[PDB]
Design brief:
4 copies of one chain form a homotetramer. With 194 residues, chain A is mostly helical. Chain A contains 8 helices and 3 strands. The first copy, chain A, folds into 2 domains: 64 residues, Orthogonal Bundle (Helix Hairpins); 112 residues, minor pseudopilin epsh fold. Helices cover 54% and strands 12% of the residues of chain A. Chains in contact: A-B, A-D, B-C, C-D. The structure holds manganese (II) ion (MN) (4 copies). Chains A, D: Destroys superoxide anion radicals which are normally produced within the cells and which are toxic to biological systems.
Chain lengths: 194, 195, 195, 194
């Protein structure tokens, strides 16, 4: 049932920040594999739940989280990147200033925790609806961001940057801000507020 | 269909003096019942999220399903694993115990030790690994079901399993539970696991 | 130097009827004492592994240090967080509670709810985040110390913290503990965290 | 104090299984960084333990495990690879046959669980001294193999194969057996038995 979404841009449009080969592999192989496996896992899960094998249904959870999370995360990620991303809306900039002091402080803080992820993971700018504040967080592997609405994600799995940056993850994390799609991020903010 | 609290295979006081009637009554009627009730609610929510294609919501419900589903699975096995007159391991289970642990005494020591060592709430398990065709021992956190092997005998070390009687002295409970291990059931589970 | 079990700032029966003298005596003299005794042993082993350059061994000891070290830290704070006559939040803490949670009633509800919801053994905490200069609530598993923020008030939901008195009814204990929250201490911790 | 060990071979000696660029980066950047950070963490830890900040000492644990584990794991890994690895000793082959049926079954089973690692991790062939049997296991991130003596490890962090294999982790896992250093593995087995 789930399908690989088309990117909102061509494979080379994020250069020089992220290469054509990376976009191509990342979308057509990595995200595709999460979608394919996700469809298969939902299948195994239904069989277990419909036949009453609660134990097997529990055993299938990590695979749903990993693949389901991979599909969720990458789907958001593509919308979060743009050749010409613009700037935050007035409402978002104001909120950024409120909760982080400045965009510069937010970028530094999110870059820092994202760079610090041990192993594979994601860094996120999110909106917490209960306390009505922007927050930053990281997630391991493909765990989706929970407890807050995702606004902007930074994939630090090595496949997100290795072909171009090799070991130098910090340069990729710092450079991704150049292609942050503030139009999309601001839209996600607006919707998270409503 | 809907999960139900299974009746115990004995009366609440049948395991004294190893486990008190008060413990047995709370443990079954309050703790296991709660897992069952919560499990039914969580399964309904999970079925809804799956049906609606709400992947994030389905994922968010997973800890609750594992906790309550695991609570149900674990306690259901645990009741069948206890008996005033449990008997002795079947010849084939005793022979396998000897083959894999040297003796029953060794198995009891090793499983008791790892079970006592559980940090916080959890369970100690004797299981059968079908791939390598061997008995193994393991512990699980919280209500995580034993996975990767077939459960044979479980020891609940959540403080509610023993506190009212044993207080802080978890080792006394773990050592004593062997006196009420239902070897008839454990042997049946073993025979079933080798099919 | 060697860790020691701190004396309670009150007598074992001083918190009745909210927490029984039996609970207080076991909790301090057996559970906390055990963390302290084990912590000293683990620190010695860890110091040895570090000195010898046994990296694998030092790493293997980490769960035991976190569990016992955390047990010590957590209980030490917990004793100071309880009082028969705790008083009321300082004006600055009350004002911050209002700023960050709307009211004290809201804070108590929100912290009680997440604390009640802890799966297995753990703790509920009111803390102060120094970076964002805000109060926050969180839970921790087992004896994991609250990290990333300064602990202000903790609620122990290990079953040994309440089972003898409350049995399975954890919510009654969590709601009731607010009646013995030592606001004098919590306020001092808050003032200290904003330095 | 800790230092980057020299490889027991030249950077291109594992070709065509693992490329010169991978060996170079993997050793001179990735393993080097674990060593450098490990030294720094031990420093922060000592200050915390010597000043009696138990809380800070606990906070430093993940960093010691990650960096300490990275140093342990990669140190073993280099010794586990060879252009001409030979074959298992008679004692090891016999033990492999005892606990897995055949070398083919062991390779399939270890390859399978290693391929299945979600995110970054390692696959291991180890020896359990208590039960006196070979076992296979996986570890997340840089967690060292615990509870058994390591004999042969397969690094499946994406940096271990991405430049050459890209997304195709299974081809790298299957191909690494060509360069398994059975001389070293058999020596580790012998020592684990004593
Ligand atoms: Mn990715
Ligand atoms: Mn129980
Ligand atoms: Mn306690
Ligand atoms: Mn590596």
């Amino acid at each position: 049932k789930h399908t690989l979404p088309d990117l909102p841009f061509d494979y080379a449009d994020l250069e020089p920040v992220i290469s054509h080969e990376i976009m191509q592999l990342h979308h057509q192989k990595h995200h595709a594999t999460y979608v394919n496996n996700l469809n298969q896992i939902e299948e195994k899960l239904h069989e277990a739940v419909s036949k009453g094998n609660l134990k097997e249904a529990i055993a299938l959870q990590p695979a749903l989280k990993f693949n389901g999370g991979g599909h969720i995360n990458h789907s958001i990620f593509w919308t979060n990147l743009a050749k010409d991303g613009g700037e935050p809306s007035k409402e978002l900039m104001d909120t950024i200033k409120r909760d982080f002091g400045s965009l510069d402080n937010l970028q530094k803080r999110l870059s820092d925790i994202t760079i610090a992820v041990q192993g594979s993971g994601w860094g996120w700018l999110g909106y917490c609806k209960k306390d009505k504040i922007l927050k930053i967080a990281t997630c391991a592997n493909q765990d989706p961001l929970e407890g807050m609405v995702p606004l902007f994600g930074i994939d630090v799995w090595e496949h997100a940057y290795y072909l171009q940056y090799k070991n130098v993850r910090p340069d990729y994390v710092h450079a991704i801000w150049k292609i942050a799609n503030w139009k999309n991020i601001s839209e996600r903010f607006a919707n998270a507020r409503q």
